[PDB]
Amino acid sequence: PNHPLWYTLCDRYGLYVVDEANIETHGMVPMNRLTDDPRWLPAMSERVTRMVQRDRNHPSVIIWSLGSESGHGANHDALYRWIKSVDPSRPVQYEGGGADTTATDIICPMYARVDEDQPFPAVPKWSIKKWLSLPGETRPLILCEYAHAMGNSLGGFAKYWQAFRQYPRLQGGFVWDWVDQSLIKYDENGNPWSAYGGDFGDTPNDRQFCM
Amino acid sequence: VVLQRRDWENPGVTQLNRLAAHPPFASWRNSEEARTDRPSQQLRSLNGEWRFAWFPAPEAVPESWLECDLPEADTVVVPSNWQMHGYDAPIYTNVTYPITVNPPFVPTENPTGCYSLTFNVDESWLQEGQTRIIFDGVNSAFHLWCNGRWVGYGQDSRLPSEFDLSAFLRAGENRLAVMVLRWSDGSYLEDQDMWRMSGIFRDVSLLHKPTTQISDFHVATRFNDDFSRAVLEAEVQMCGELRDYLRVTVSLWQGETQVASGTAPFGGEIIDERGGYADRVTLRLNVENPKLWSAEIPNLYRAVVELHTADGTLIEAEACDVGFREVRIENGLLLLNGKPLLIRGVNRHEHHPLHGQVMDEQTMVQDILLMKQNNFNAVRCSHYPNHPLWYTLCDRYGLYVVDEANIETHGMVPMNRLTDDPRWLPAMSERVTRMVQRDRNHPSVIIWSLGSESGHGANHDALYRWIKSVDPSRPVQYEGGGADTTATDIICPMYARVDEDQPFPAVPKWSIKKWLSLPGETRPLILCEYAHAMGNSLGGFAKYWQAFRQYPRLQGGFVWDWVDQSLIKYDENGNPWSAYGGDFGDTPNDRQFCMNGLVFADRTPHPALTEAKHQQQFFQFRLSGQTIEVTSEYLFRHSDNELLHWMVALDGKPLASGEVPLDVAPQGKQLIELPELPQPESAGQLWLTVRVVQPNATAWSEAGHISAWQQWRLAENLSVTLPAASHAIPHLTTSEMDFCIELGNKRWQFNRQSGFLSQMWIGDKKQLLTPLRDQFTRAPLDNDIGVSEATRIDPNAWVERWKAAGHYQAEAALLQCTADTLADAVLITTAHAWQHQGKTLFISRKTYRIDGSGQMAITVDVEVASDTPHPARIGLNCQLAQVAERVNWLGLGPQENYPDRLTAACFDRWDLPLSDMYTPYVFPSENGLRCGTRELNYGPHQWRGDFQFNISRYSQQQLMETSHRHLLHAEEGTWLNIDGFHMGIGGDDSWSPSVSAEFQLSAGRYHYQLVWCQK
Amino acid sequence: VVLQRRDWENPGVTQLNRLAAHPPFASWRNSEEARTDRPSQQLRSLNGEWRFAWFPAPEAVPESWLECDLPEADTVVVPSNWQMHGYDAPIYTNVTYPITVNPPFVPTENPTGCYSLTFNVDESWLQEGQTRIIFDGVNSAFHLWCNGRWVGYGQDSRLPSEFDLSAFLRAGEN
Ligand SMILES: CC(C)S[C@@H]1O[C@H](CO)[C@H](O)[C@H](O)[C@H]1O
Ligand SMILES: CC(C)S[C@@H]1O[C@H](CO)[C@H](O)[C@H](O)[C@H]1O
Ligand SMILES: [Mg+2]
Ligand SMILES: [Mg+2]
Ligand SMILES: [Mg+2]
Ligand code: NA
Ligand code: NA
Ligand code: NA
Ligand code: NA
Ligand code: NA
Ligand code: NA
């Protein structure tokens, strides 16, 4: 959840917002180790429920999200249903555990390609055009993350937009991402320069992946 | 810090340092011991003698107690509830919380039980591995100490709390200290309608596991379309260091035959982008033609889970009983192994009259045998997870179980105040999740329940989905918030009636037949509670069962409930008596509402149990000419231990009988042609009675057990013969105060002022102690009273309608009393009016005809004002001078039966001791009626006609004035109530009028006739 | 109790004494002010200059700090991240956790920020009504004390933690 003024400005200027719970357990092995564990359900529930209690009156918020990159656990299903029960007015989405689990109203993959399948075991990233028409599938597809804009990038961005415009159920996506996470440091002359992972003696680090 | 933190007043803290929940463990170190389920040397019981001291509040507990025993403390048996030892009083309240509603706070005066134990630990247990303590039940919260050091804290009275004591223990002598709090924030979720008690009330034990251990295992069984093939899937989790050489073997056994086995290293399949569970393995075993588990045939296999090295050194084995069965809802039907269930259920609390809420194997086994013997196939754990042995017995004997989370918030306003509050979601979630983690491997558990009477809140919806995600094998039900919410797979109402709607705002109870077909509705309907068996009850029970059999989607229900929650107290002379609410000084209380059982607290049956056995029969019968059609309601079994006995009797006199083995396929039919029955020598009604007998003993019943019965009227030859004309003529004598009639040694006396037969003589001995007078009232049943109290009248209750109308105080006013001498008889004609404050309630018109053969014919015609509440009965009563040993009657019996509870009774010649004609309901009321009676015999007296009667040493007055059966005193002689008509008893619930229109005495004019003579 | 309970290594305790969550409040006592979304006298910002001291672990925090300002502490702007003032290093890691994976435990070397503010409260707030403090964002967990007395505890870096201070406040300086 963002600084409270963010939603005020989104209401007044006009942006659709996905409001997302402060839950990410990416570094767990497997990714759902905590989110499938009932012991972690109370802590998780508060991150979801207190977000909804705070932001439910903002018109800019059109979708709730259960968080980011935490696999798919039973705790996700429980909290998905909590929101659906408490606030029928907004769909709930969540990408973890394959982007099309029982905890999401929207197929919301990250970095699924337009035409190319990536058939990873358990959590494949189907071509977005193919994903829509899989046997039994009926949901809309909106990438929670696509077009990783890291450095000299956004090659093949036009390919997404062509597909979005042609297929009714391909309803767009959220680019990753808005702003480089570089920090200002100062050299011997007091001149400012942009720094990234590792430039603060921080180790282990992931270098320029913050940009 | 412990006293400073006040964790028992914070729903955010439900435990501290408590280990994860899991299925029953024993940590066998021998696989054969695991297979046979023999005792484990790694599982010690700490039950027995403990040290106990009582305190008014935790603040009053001295610090010395942590390291050293208190000399003022006593030695008590554990498990126990401390109210049962007399330390403080048990409280009986139904809905209203026993504490002020101020969540999360409890009273500062919070009774505190200080338990402690000094015990030996062997050296081998501490040299290696993990020693844990398991508290199966602590009501309602506790802090734990070991050798003076603080270990942890637990809440939820009904699930095990486990702690690692490895770092706390020493070889030789150790001391545990447990501070148990009566009230906590947990109490707000424990508002079940039962005695409120506290203490360490379930087993305490020590479990030794190795460092590298099975920490969890789940067993699933999936099937092909016709159940001729199954896959057993076992997921096994380990804790400790992960190693390449580690293996799990899951083997499945049928007796001493191994049927299948699978071995695998640890390392699950890929789950997501970060891999899979390296600490888990799933084993899949193929089973061809599995023997299926049901309540009809509880086929069980044994699964042994062996954690071992690659070359076969056993680290440890755990095990469970496996029942191959599939539970699913399809097309609106609840199916077991592909067949639609009919639930013959009962709710059962964990209750013992001497031990409180402590359960033992013997009482559990007693309950299960009685249940199965009375045609029950299902039990609901109202309203909390049970003692762990219960599920083992249900697995083995064969009962379907609803396992229910320990959540009831009934006393909140509105009922969902806590359950819709996300703040209480953590506490609630643990009560659901830790139940499922514990009981998910028991085949007897077929349905999960989210709790009881807590409205419908969003927390329910969340936990509903959690269970559906974690365990697809079982439907989830929950009644709260209207019985058909988004949190339930089954429409599961409580006390919804068969045909009558009760359209309460927001949470209506539709008639069950109507409910099924509401627009858009598709789900099965199984009542979580119905037929409230409080006292003289179960009226209208047959109506439910007729509906269950007719409607596919009405799949039965669970009676409320199994056993009276009465407690034993002792009088001045040390003699025991049964107590209910308020009898311990507890106030506010809800009096006798704790007693709703089919059985008394000592497991003696109420009469209602036989009605339930009869209606829940598994064989159905039709008669056409000479042919009996038997239909089986068994879904899976053939009738391979059943024979049909038939008997034809003429007014109780045996004519012909025979036996025919039953050969009926599940849901099949069998036709039995009776031989030509020799025609009766005399007049009267021929009756056919059939009974299903079980020739062989089973695990649950004895040889000769009767499982089903049914009766029909065959031919009737009406008597046309005139009684032989006698030469004697009765002689009428007249005074200002009496008409007297004399015939031989017999004399009748009619008081001309009262208009009643005041006395009769045989020889010259008085027969009456009180005159023979009309009676329009009864000592009110629990159903008549409802929730009405002296200080808080419910004007809608039948008893209050009768009281306000003057029924109990209306005095007979004589209108007419004449005598005429006939050719061979004396005719007395009388007329009375019963009036209350100018209003005439009843008129009784009678003739008494005393003829030369000694017989007195009494003809009675009653008028009942259409605007008075319909009377409880229309009959006569009198106190006979005689006290005789036996009661002999031709009518319905042998047991107590009422007009809306008589289907189980059979018409025959019955003979019982007088004491059996009285039903010792703990709260006394009208009791012991027998209906459809044509002849009654008591001492020298015979009454003939078509009547209902009861007979006892207790007047209707004493019964209605006395609140406890032990306070009743036999009166001089015998009180006889002979009714022409008697109102239904009801019982759809016991808090609103429930007697159906067809059983109310509303006809306005009533006629009955009796013949009184000496035999 | 605070150092003994280690509430920051227990996922069962995510708060102590925290108030219920709710949509943005300003407690206007004038309807026209509420309509126009103009500032509310009942909603006060405590943003500005605070006193701050860095510690390598909670055990290193001296008890004197509860009652009295540490003389060695600095005056810093709040809201802020203390890494941006150079007290310790910000860490950039993507997937891999910045701490050893061993739930619910964290490193014994646990950088601790001791913040404090001396402030005044209007007289009228003490006679009547309820005064709460709202921390819109504290990363990653915190205990709160008012005038030496312990108030509560909170977790979740990205949602407001609110605490009733009505029984803790006094006339003059707090
Ligand atoms: C496969 C890994 C690089 S995960 C990848 O890292 C990205 C780095 O910018 C983003 O954080 C994405 O959300 C994440 O999926
Ligand atoms: C309106 C009240 C009587 S509620 C009623 O009380 C019964 C008393 O035995 C049971 O506890 C039922 O579960 C409950 O619904
Ligand atoms: Mg608590
Ligand atoms: Mg209740
Ligand atoms: Mg914590
Ligand atoms: Na589109
Ligand atoms: Na990044
Ligand atoms: Na049915
Ligand atoms: Na009362
Ligand atoms: Na009851
Ligand atoms: Na009575």
Coordinates of N, CA and C and ligand atoms in Angstrom, one line a residue, chain B residues 580 592 779-780 785 922-926 956-964 968, ligand 11:
Chain B
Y580 N -29.4 -29.9 37.7 CA -29.3 -29.1 36.4 C -28.9 -27.6 36.8
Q592 N -33.2 -26.3 33.5 CA -33.2 -27.7 33.0 C -32.9 -27.7 31.5
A779 N -49.6 -31.7 34.1 CA -48.4 -31.1 34.6 C -47.5 -30.8 33.4
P780 N -47.2 -29.5 33.2 CA -46.6 -29.1 31.9 C -45.3 -29.7 31.6
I785 N -43.8 -25.4 28.6 CA -43.2 -24.3 29.3 C -42.3 -23.4 28.4
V922 N -35.9 -35.9 34.8 CA -35.3 -35.2 35.9 C -36.1 -34.0 36.3
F923 N -36.6 -33.2 35.3 CA -37.7 -32.3 35.6 C -39.0 -33.0 35.4
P924 N -39.8 -33.1 36.5 CA -41.0 -33.9 36.5 C -42.1 -33.2 35.7
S925 N -42.9 -34.0 35.0 CA -44.0 -33.5 34.2 C -45.0 -34.6 34.0
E926 N -46.1 -34.3 33.2 CA -46.9 -35.3 32.7 C -46.0 -36.4 32.0
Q956 N -50.9 -35.3 39.3 CA -50.6 -34.2 38.3 C -50.1 -33.0 39.1
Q957 N -50.8 -32.7 40.2 CA -50.4 -31.6 41.0 C -49.0 -31.7 41.6
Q958 N -48.7 -32.8 42.2 CA -47.3 -32.9 42.7 C -46.3 -32.8 41.6
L959 N -46.6 -33.4 40.5 CA -45.7 -33.3 39.3 C -45.4 -31.9 38.9
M960 N -46.4 -31.1 38.8 CA -46.3 -29.7 38.3 C -45.7 -28.7 39.4
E961 N -45.7 -29.2 40.7 CA -45.2 -28.4 41.8 C -43.8 -28.7 42.2
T962 N -43.3 -29.9 41.7 CA -42.0 -30.4 42.0 C -41.0 -30.2 40.9
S963 N -39.8 -29.7 41.1 CA -38.9 -29.3 40.1 C -37.8 -30.3 39.8
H964 N -37.6 -31.3 40.7 CA -36.6 -32.3 40.6 C -37.2 -33.7 41.0
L968 N -39.7 -36.0 44.6 CA -41.0 -36.6 44.5 C -41.2 -37.6 45.6
Ligands
NA11 NA -42.6 -29.9 37.5

